Amino acid sequence: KKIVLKSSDGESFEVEEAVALESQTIAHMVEDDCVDNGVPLPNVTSKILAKVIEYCKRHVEAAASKAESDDDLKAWDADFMKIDQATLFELILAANYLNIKNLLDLTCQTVADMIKGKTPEEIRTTFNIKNDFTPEEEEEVRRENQWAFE
Amino acid sequence: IESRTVVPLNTWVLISNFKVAYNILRRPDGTFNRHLAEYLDRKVTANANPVDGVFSFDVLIDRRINLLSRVYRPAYADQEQPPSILDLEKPVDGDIVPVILFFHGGSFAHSSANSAIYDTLCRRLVGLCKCVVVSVNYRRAPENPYPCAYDDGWIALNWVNSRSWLKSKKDSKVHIFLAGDSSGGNIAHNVALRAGESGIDVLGNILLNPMFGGNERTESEKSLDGKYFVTVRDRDWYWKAFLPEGEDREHPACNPFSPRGKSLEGVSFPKSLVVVAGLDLIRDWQLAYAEGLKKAGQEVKLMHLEKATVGFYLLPNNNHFHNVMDEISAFVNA
Amino acid sequence: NLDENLVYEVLKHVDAKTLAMSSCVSKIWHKTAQDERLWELICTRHWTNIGCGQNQLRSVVLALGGFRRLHSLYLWPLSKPNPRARFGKDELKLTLSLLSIRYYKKMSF
Amino acid sequence: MDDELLAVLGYKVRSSEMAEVALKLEQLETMMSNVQEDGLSHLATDTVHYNPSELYSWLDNMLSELNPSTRSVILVDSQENGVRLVHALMACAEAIQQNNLTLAEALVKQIGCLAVSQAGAMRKVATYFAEALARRIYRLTLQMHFYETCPYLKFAHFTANQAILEAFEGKKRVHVIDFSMNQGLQWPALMQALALREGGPPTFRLTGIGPPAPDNSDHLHEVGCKLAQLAEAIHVEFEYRGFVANSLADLDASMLELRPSDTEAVAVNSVFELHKLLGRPGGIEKVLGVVKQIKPVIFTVVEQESNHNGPVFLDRFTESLHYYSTLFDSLEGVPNSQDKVMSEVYLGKQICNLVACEGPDRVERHETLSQWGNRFGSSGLAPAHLGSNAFKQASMLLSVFNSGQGYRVEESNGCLMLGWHTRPLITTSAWKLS
Ligand SMILES: C=C1C[C@]23C[C@@]1(O)CC[C@H]2[C@@]12C=C[C@H](O)[C@@](C)(C(=O)O1)[C@H]2[C@@H]3C(=O)O
């Protein structure tokens, strides 16, 4: 079976039914019907939906073949994480809005890995964020964590 | 079955129990079970009161690295009462008094200076050789690898040489002999090498079943593997847990006669007594070590015991014990 | 412009020392850092074959103080020499004994 | 009898069981070679061993599980004019034992004059000793700080909980009798351990006995209330009872309201308090007899390994001097603080009382393992072999402060000793009804 997904912009993507059932939310809406006419998405960009669909596609295909391998999968995942910052951000929001656990773990692991071995003056530089602590609060939190600075 | 025919029953049971204990304390990853080892270990305490002509006491020679030294000496003839704390370090009486600085065995991993198996050996050494004996408690890999043992030996040697109550009438100098067994043989050899080009003069060395090795499997490892309470798996684990990660057995601390090691010819080295048990797994290396000395131009008397194994100097119920003791007594009191 | 839930999802998979360092970057991250689930997971990382429930133990530890004070008071110095070492049952017994004794020390009559 | 060679070596093997031991060793070896690394990991961390000197029993246990005097002296390096001080102290003791007062007074003065330039621990030991001899010539919070500055009480308390816990597994009602409540800093850990157990946290009853309040207050009530509140905060049944008494000779078996032995288990605890009874003629014996009448499952004793109950005063002086000098030497590395000063003052007071109070007033009369064991063996008490677990716990304890250095636990004959390297200082053990 083929499912038509409609992005917010208006691009249409043809997907394998199986691939669609990888999303438990889409599967749940499909059992509840009212989805045979089309499954629209309110907040989802066509480019990010396309990237997630390629990910689920490849994964599903690999899984089916094996049932009928892990190194190739790992290589593909490492090759699909060669993007910048803001694209990973749009991908995490999309993964949350659609609930695809495996992609969420991969993206959270990549963000965790980049912020590995970083200090308070480094993470701030990477994300350009505002430290909003008062001097007293900052010294108190630093003192609570002083064991980590040795 | 073969092991029950070459040694008595008590030595067999002792060595077998040690072998089992250190089997169950080994770990493939490389870590060592320290707490259970210290539990299963049997230690003793110093006793200032004379016991068959031998008292003893602990000396905290170094405090930064908890380097302790247990000193033994003969009981005092002119003192009927037990020596007091003040009298413990009184200068010795006699023209020449030897001082044996002893290092115990245990493949840099087992036992300690206050262990009973070595306390008894030091007491017997004092009794038969009639001289002072200082037992050094060096640090033990794998928690503290190379080169902390040679440093501890060197510091203890400096402390022994720097004393005043341990001296000689004829030359106002200390007559120091370095001795060791198993791993202590290697430590004694390295500290003697260091002293050779430092100023301290050493009289001699007493290497007992020294622990040397290399990469190329000799011809006594294959056949003897797992026959006399000694295997090769352990021979690799102990060398791996001692040398620095990312190093082979051709390191100089493992094989002095290596292409990277400095030649012994042209440098000062003292006389030495190499005792080699024929039935030990490491019989081709110890003998090779003696030959390296022989071609290096240094004096060495080889004592090949054709029917001895490891641990032949822990119980007095054999014939090799008396022999070795007599040779050391004639080599120290010469 | 990150939210709260996603910060927790990201930080679920970070190591102890890095999470402690990250606790001092900003307010939202500081607030996310004390959620006892993260420290519970970091403390029960190597606890194989404990012998009691993970809920009962959780109740007791929350009664006595928490997990941030159990891994940054006794577990840390005890693991300072050898980092790569799994914590058995003895580590749990010792650390909880010290934590309960400290709670008694701070207790008021 | 026992093999001479093995005995001096450090092992207890009968001469009629050598062959048996050998055979067991061979079987154990083959079995260990048959199994893989898992077998060894199992014996490394899971199993426990009791009394390794007994090769027979130890080997048997392993097989079944796999297939289901002496005076120690430590000369320190910090000594440049220490002989003059020790000599003077000995001279003072000798003059006190020879009846001469003027000599002793002059000697004391000289000691102070030579002790004013000494540094390190020698200054404190010599000053406190000189004060003690001055008191002798004239008649012819501290604990909390000490517990927070020394491992002695912490190690004793933890080893005691481990022993009682190992003697309370698989029971229901547990009663505990404590001969020294003090602050009740040992019971928290025991309560949690009895809570996070397998089978359910059983009912916990506690009866503590303490010395008469000197300020007419209520300390046992505060400890009981704190313990009950923490109990509830931990979810375990708990009954408290406090008692006030002078010594331990007045304690009776009826004045304790005991339940039938057939429906409960009783455990007796003592941490540095038994050596206070030796001064009354018949005391220790009476208390031992009442304890026997109580029929408990374990009796935990923690003591100081030193002979100070000797008749001759000179011997006492010498022994105490060296023991306290090594004790003071063991606290010179920690930085200047308040707990350290408080502990030093406490030690000083202890030393002064010892070298100034005689007769029954003197309560600091210690003994060694051998003596204590002989006293216990005359009444019908057998030893209780601690295991590797307690050893490991103590090890970790010492490793938490100052990167585990100086103090070292040594197991000997089924008892543990925490000592400064090779000098035993604290000896903990457990006994039971023979
Ligand atoms: C694993 C080892 C190491 C042994 C040989 C053994 O195969 C068995 C136990 C060790 C040992 C125990 C005490 C003695 O120091 C030694 C020389 C011995 O005879 O046996 C010790 C000897 C050694 O340290 O080389």
d(CA D362, CA D364): 6
Q: Which residue of D has its CA nearest to C57?
A: D196
Calculate the alpha carbon distances from D407 to B34, D152, D196, D397 in Å. 16, 10, 30, 10
CA angle D38–D40–D44, rounded 5-degree value: 115
Among the listed residues D420, D392, D318, the one whose alpha carbon sits nearest the alpha carbon of residue D158: D392
d(CA A78, CA A97): 23
Partner residues linked to B275 by β-bridges: B208, B303
Q: Which two tokens stand for residue B180?
A: 């060791």
d(CA B159, CA B89): 14
Strands B175-181 and B132-136: unpaired
What is the longest distance spanned by two Cα atoms in chain B? 59
Of all protein residues, whose CA lies closest to atom 5 belonging to ligand 1? Answer: B230
Total of domains in chain D: 3
Experimental method: cryo-EM
Name the CA dihedral angle for D135, D141, D146, D148, rounded to a multiple of 10 degrees: -170
Other Cβ atoms closer than 10 A to D16: 8
Instruction: Please tell me what DSSP assigns to residue D12.
Output: B
Among the listed residues A123, A93, A144, A118, the one whose alpha carbon sits nearest the alpha carbon of residue C9: A93
d(CA D12, CA D4): 10
Other Cβ atoms closer than 10 A to D278: 16
Whether domain A115-150 has CATH 1.20.120.80: no
Q: Would residue B52 show up in a list of annotated catalytic residues for this protein?
A: no
Q: Which two tokens stand for residue B32?
A: 């060592």
Kindly determine whether residue A116 and residue C24, on different chains, have CB atoms separated by under 8 Å.
no
d(CA A63, CA A69): 9
Cα dihedral sign, D12-D15-D20-D21: positive
d(CA B262, CA B295): 14
Residues with Cβ within 8 Å of residue B331, at least 6 apart in sequence:
B204, B206, B271, B273, B301
Q: Are B270 and B192 in contact (CB under 8 A)?
A: yes
Q: Which two tokens stand for residue C40?
A: 């519970």
Task: Count Cβ atoms within 10 A of the Cβ of residue D257 and give its class: 0-12 exposed, 13-18 middle, 19 or more buried.
Answer: exposed
Instruction: Please tell me what DSSP assigns to residue C46.
Output: S
Task: Fill in the amino acid letter for B150.
Answer: Y
Q: Which CATH architecture group holds A2-99?
A: 2-Layer Sandwich (3.30)
Q: Are C22 and C33 in contact (CB under 8 A)?
A: yes
Among the listed residues A54, D34, D419, A32, the one whose alpha carbon sits nearest the alpha carbon of residue B44: D419
Instruction: Please tell me what DSSP assigns to residue D54.
Output: B
Among the listed residues B47, B118, B124, B136, the one whose alpha carbon sits nearest the alpha carbon of residue B326: B124
Q: Which two tokens stand for residue D362?
A: 């003197």
d(CA B57, CA B132): 12
Subunits next to B (3 or more Cβ pairs <8 Å) are: C, D
- Ligand 1 site-directed mutation target among B3, B7, B15, B42, most atoms within 8 Å of CB: B15
Task: Count Cβ atoms within 10 A of the Cβ of residue D285 and give its class: 0-12 exposed, 13-18 middle, 19 or more buried.
Answer: middle
Q: Which helix (H) or strand (E) holds B263?
A: none
Of all protein residues, whose CA lies closest to atom 7 belonging to ligand 1? Answer: B230
Q: Is B77 strand, coil or helix?
A: coil
Q: Is D244 strand, coil or helix?
A: strand
Calculate the alpha carbon distances from B46 to A103, B49, B106, D86, D145 in Å. 67, 9, 21, 21, 32
Residue D429 lies in a domain: no
CA angle D216–D220–D222, rounded 5-degree value: 95
Number of inter-chain CB pairs under 8 A, A vs C: 60
d(CA B275, CA B286): 9
Q: Are D288 and D253 in contact (CB under 8 A)?
A: no
Measured between its terminal Cα atoms, the distance across chain B in Å is 42
Beta strands per DSSP E along D159-203: 174-178
CA angle B226–B228–B232, rounded 5-degree value: 40
Among the listed residues B230, B243, B233, B209, the one whose alpha carbon sits nearest the alpha carbon of residue B104: B209
CA angle A95–A98–A101, rounded 5-degree value: 55
Residue of A111, A120, A144 with shortest CB distance to C25 = A120
| Boundaries of every domain in chain B | 3-332
Residue D396 lies in a domain: no
Q: The domain containing residue D346 runs over which residues?
A: 82-140+308-354
Q: Which two tokens stand for residue A62?
A: 């690999």
Helices (H) and strands (E) in chain D, counts: 16, 10
Cα(B109) to centroid of ligand 1, in Å?
10
Residues with Cβ within 8 Å of residue B107, at least 6 apart in sequence:
B182, B183, B211, B234, B238, B242
The angstrom resolution of this structure is: 2.8
Q: Which two tokens stand for residue B279?
A: 């039935």
> What CATH number should be reported for the domain holding residue D37?
1.10.10.1290
Q: Which helix (H) or strand (E) holds D253?
A: none
Instruction: Please tell me what DSSP assigns to residue D74.
Output: E
Beta strands per DSSP E along C5-73: none
Beta strands per DSSP E along A18-96: 39-40
Kindly determine whether residue B16 and residue D71, on different chains, have CB atoms separated by under 8 Å.
no
d(CA D340, CA D99): 37
d(CA B73, CA B126): 6
Measured between its terminal Cα atoms, the distance across chain C in Å is 47
Cα dihedral sign, D402-D406-D407-D413: positive
Name the CA dihedral angle for B198, B204, B208, B214, rounded to a multiple of 10 degrees: 40
Among the listed residues B104, B197, B115, B200, the one whose alpha carbon sits nearest the alpha carbon of residue B155: B200
C-chain residues near D402 (CB < 8 A) = none
Q: Which two tokens stand for residue D363?
A: 């309560």
Q: Would residue B41 show up in a list of annotated catalytic residues for this protein?
A: no
B146 is in an annotated binding site: no
Give the minimum alpha-carbon distance from D346 to chain B in angstroms, rounded to a whole number: 26
Instruction: Please tell me what DSSP assigns to residue C57.
Output: H
Q: Are D334 and D346 in contact (CB under 8 A)?
A: no
Q: Are D208 and D222 in contact (CB under 8 A)?
A: no
Strands B54-62 and D74-75: parallel
The breaks in chain A (C to N more than 2.5 Å) occur after: 68
d(CA D28, CA D380): 36
Residue by residue, DSSP assigns D303-361 as: EEB-----S-HHHHHHHHHHHHHHHHHTTSSSPS-SHHHHHHHHHHHHHHHHTT--TTS
Q: Is D14 strand, coil or helix?
A: strand
Q: Which two tokens stand for residue D389?
A: 């677990």
Q: What are phi and psi of A50, to 5 degrees?
A: -60, -45
d(CA D60, CA D333): 46
d(CA C39, CA C17): 11
Say which residue the tokens 């001759």 belong to. D312
Q: Are D406 and D421 in contact (CB under 8 A)?
A: yes
Q: Which helix (H) or strand (E) holds B126?
A: helix B116-129
> Using only C-alpha atoms, what is the Rg of chain B?
20
CA angle D198–D203–D205, rounded 5-degree value: 130
| Boundaries of every domain in chain A | 2-99, 115-150
Say which residue the tokens 């092992």 belong to. D11
Residue of B9, B38, B42 with shortest CB distance to D18 = B9
B182 is in an annotated binding site: yes
Residues with Cβ within 8 Å of residue B222, at least 6 apart in sequence:
none
Q: Are D161 and D394 in contact (CB under 8 A)?
A: no
Task: Count Cβ atoms within 10 A of the Cβ of residue A26 and give its class: 0-12 exposed, 13-18 middle, 19 or more buried.
Answer: buried
d(CA B144, CA B131): 32
Q: Are B312 and B318 in contact (CB under 8 A)?
A: yes
d(CA A35, CA A29): 7
d(CA B281, CA B213): 11
Q: How far is CA D340 from the centre of its chain?
A: 21
d(CA D15, CA B187): 37
Among the listed residues D257, D288, D255, D270, the one whose alpha carbon sits nearest the alpha carbon of residue D374: D288
Q: Are A111 and A88 in contact (CB under 8 A)?
A: yes
d(CA D152, CA D303): 10
Measured between its terminal Cα atoms, the distance across chain A in Å is 59
B107 is in an annotated binding site: yes
Q: Which helix (H) or strand (E) holds D145?
A: helix D142-149
CA angle D56–D62–D63, rounded 5-degree value: 90
Give the minimum alpha-carbon distance from B216 to chain C in angstroms, rounded to a whole number: 33
Q: Which two tokens stand for residue B199?
A: 């100023």
Say which residue the tokens 């390190």 belong to. D120
Of all protein residues, whose CA lies closest to atom 18 belonging to ligand 1? Answer: B311
B183 is in an annotated binding site: no
Q: Which two tokens stand for residue B265?
A: 């010819």
Residue by residue, DSSP assigns B185-247 as: HHHHHHHHHHHHTTS----EEEEES-----SS--TTTTTTTTTSS--HHHHHHHHHTTSPSS-
Subunits next to C (3 or more Cβ pairs <8 Å) are: A, B, D
Name the CA dihedral angle for D425, D426, D432, D433, rounded to a multiple of 10 degrees: 50
d(CA D234, CA D195): 8
d(CA D345, CA C66): 37
Q: Are B142 and B241 in contact (CB under 8 A)?
A: yes
Q: Are B316 and B324 in contact (CB under 8 A)?
A: no
d(CA C29, CA B334): 78
Q: Is D302 strand, coil or helix?
A: strand
d(CA D323, CA D350): 13
Task: Count Cβ atoms within 10 A of the Cβ of residue D107 and give its class: 0-12 exposed, 13-18 middle, 19 or more buried.
Answer: buried
> What CATH number should be reported for the domain holding residue D296?
3.40.50.150
**One domain, residues D159 and D252:** yes
Instruction: Please tell me what DSSP assigns to residue B92.
Output: P
Other Cβ atoms closer than 10 A to D25: 21
Give the minimum alpha-carbon distance from D68 to chain C in angstroms, rounded to a whole number: 20
Q: How far is CA C46 from the centre of its chain?
A: 12
What is the longest distance spanned by two Cα atoms in chain C? 47
Say which residue the tokens 């396309």 belong to. A50
Other Cβ atoms closer than 10 A to D87: 13
Strands D416-420 and D204-210: unpaired
Calculate the alpha carbon distances from D383 to A149, D297, D377, D413, D433 in Å. 49, 12, 9, 9, 9
**One domain, residues D251 and D171:** yes
**One domain, residues D288 and D377:** yes
Number of inter-chain CB pairs under 8 A, C vs D: 65
Residues with Cβ within 8 Å of residue A131, at least 6 apart in sequence:
A120, A124, A138, C25, C26
Active-site residue (options: B182, B183, B220, B272): B182
Partner residues linked to D301 by β-bridges: D270, D429
Cα dihedral sign, D320-D322-D324-D325: positive
The residue count for chain D: 434
Other Cβ atoms closer than 10 A to D251: 17
Task: Fill in the amino acid letter for B49.
Answer: N
Say which residue the tokens 């030393």 belong to. D351
Measured between its terminal Cα atoms, the distance across chain D in Å is 23
Other Cβ atoms closer than 10 A to B313: 22
C-chain residues near D195 (CB < 8 A) = 60
> Using only C-alpha atoms, what is the Rg of chain A?
20
Cα dihedral sign, B240-B246-B249-B252: negative
Partner residues linked to B5 by β-bridges: none
d(CA B176, CA B157): 9
Q: Which two tokens stand for residue B187?
A: 């430590």
User: Helix-strand-coil percent breakdown of chain B, rounded to 5?
Assistant: 35, 15, 50
Strands B67-74 and B204-208: unpaired
d(CA D208, CA D241): 6
Plot region of B145 (φ>0 → left; ψ -120 to 50 → alpha; else → beta): beta
Domain at B3-332: CATH code: 3.40.50.1820
Residue by residue, DSSP assigns D380-392 as: TEEE---BHHHHH
Q: What are phi and psi of B171, to 5 degrees?
A: -130, 0
d(CA D311, CA B285): 61
